[PDB]
């Protein structure tokens, strides 16, 4: 069929340090495709850990060309945009929604860490939402095997954003990489329940990280979470990365397991 491989860049979704996310609509389909414009090592980690990927919480990869010194890399269009958008300021979200979002997010890191991947950069500005409002985990830029041939290898590398990455990361020189994922899924949780984030860095000079610790759960923004998903956060945001609760785990949780939210609105009549 002629002129299928062409596409239109319709309209900027988002712009980052490595360049733009373009909207891609196929000429013939009208299929839509985000476009990942990267005007470069770095991104051929990045497509060869996308080429892996295959799950229903995970942003599709398509394929990539590169036309001179520009990469671009289909990937899957999420019209529900950022889940950060989700999160109304000192606010959060209805609860019921967030434990979705949450049973969504452990599904896409139970997978990703089962084919030996962490994502190392967890946030709601990278976890996307569909027209359904289904989470996929996106940008595997920062990305790396963490498990190969059966074998795991411990990581020293310095990577994520400060408010979301574990204490281990800034006091000890190697670290295991699962551990990591579940801290930044336990502030993204928080973030969700209270629409603030509790500190700039989990460091002792923190005061807000020395009240954690000090269980001071009267404060914000541990005082808007309720009881249940507070038990589960007290949980996950353990200091040391070995007394920490692993995904199997938090899949057993109280609050995790618990009914509150139902399923899509169907269409109904009476009588
Ligand atoms: C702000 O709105 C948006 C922002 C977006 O990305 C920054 C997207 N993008 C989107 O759906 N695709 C994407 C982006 N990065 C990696 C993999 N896939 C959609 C929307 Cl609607």
Not at 25 to 54: F, G, P, Q, Y
Not at 87 to 110: K, N, S
Not at 126 to 155: C, Q
Not at 193 to 211: H, M, R, V
Request: aromatic share 10%.
């Amino acid at each position: 069929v002629p002129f299928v491989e062409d596409w239109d860049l319709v309209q900027t979704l988002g712009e980052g340090a490595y360049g733009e996310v373009q909207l891609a609509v196929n000429r013939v389909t009208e299929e839509a495709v985000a476009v990942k414009i990267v005007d470069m090592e770095n991104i051929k980690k990045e497509i060869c850990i996308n080429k892996m990927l295959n799950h229903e919480n995970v942003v599709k990869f398509y394929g990539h060309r590169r036309e001179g010194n520009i990469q671009y890399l289909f990937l899957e269009y999420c019209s529900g945009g950022e889940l950060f958008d989700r999160i109304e300021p000192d606010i959060g979200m209805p609860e019921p929604d967030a434990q979705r979002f949450f049973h969504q997010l452990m599904a896409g890191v139970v997978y990703l860490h089962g084919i030996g991947i962490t994502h190392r950069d967890i946030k709601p500005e990278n976890l996307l939402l569909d027209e359904r409002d289904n989470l996929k985990i996106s940008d595997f830029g920062l990305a790396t095997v963490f498990r190969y041939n059966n074998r795991e290898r411990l990581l020293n590398k310095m990577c994520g954003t400060l408010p979301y990455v574990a204490p281990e990361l800034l006091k000890r020189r190697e670290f295991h990489a699962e551990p990591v994922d579940v801290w930044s899924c336990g502030i993204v949780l928080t973030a969700m329940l209270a629409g603030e984030l509790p500190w700039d860095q989990p460091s002792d000079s923190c005061q807000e990280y020395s009240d954690w610790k000090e269980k001071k759960t009267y404060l914000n923004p541990w005082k808007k979470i309720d009881s249940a998903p507070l038990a589960l956060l007290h949980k996950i945001l353990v200091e040391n990365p070995s007394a920490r609760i692993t995904i199997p785990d938090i899949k057993k949780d109280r609050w995790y397991n618990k009914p509150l939210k139902k399923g899509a609105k169907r269409p109904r009549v009476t009588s």
